[PDB]
Design a protein around this nucleic acid. Structure first.
Length: 59
DNA sequence: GGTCAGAAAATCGGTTGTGGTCAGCTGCTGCCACCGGTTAACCTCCAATTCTGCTGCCAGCCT
């Protein structure tokens, strides 16, 4: 019953905590988003350039 | 053996004359102090006691 069940319960209980230090709170806040790779960075950059040209052209 | 023009003193003050003298910028010119931008192998989660009041918590009569 220790196969991520009680671990999940303690994970949600730790997620609903306070964590009264600001550095620890910022690290816990930034730990949620997952990492990337080269093709994902390429497609994000292409979307950035397309959106920037779209708003420039529309203005 | 006496009255009137001239000469000779500082004195208060205007001229004046130039002889520097100091500053007042004035470029200006070099420079130097300061602000802003840029760098493309990869490597992605911290360093004692004493007293009073308040709040959170669990059994437990009452509905």
């Amino acid at each position: 019953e220790d196969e991520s069940e009680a671990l999940r319960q303690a994970r949600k209980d730790a997620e609903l905590t306070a964590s009264a230090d600001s550095v620890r709170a910022y690290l816990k806040q930034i730990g949620k988003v997952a990492l990337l790779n080269a093709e994902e960075e390429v497609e994000l950059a292409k979307r950035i350039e397309a959106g920037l040209y779209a708003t420039q052209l529309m203005t």
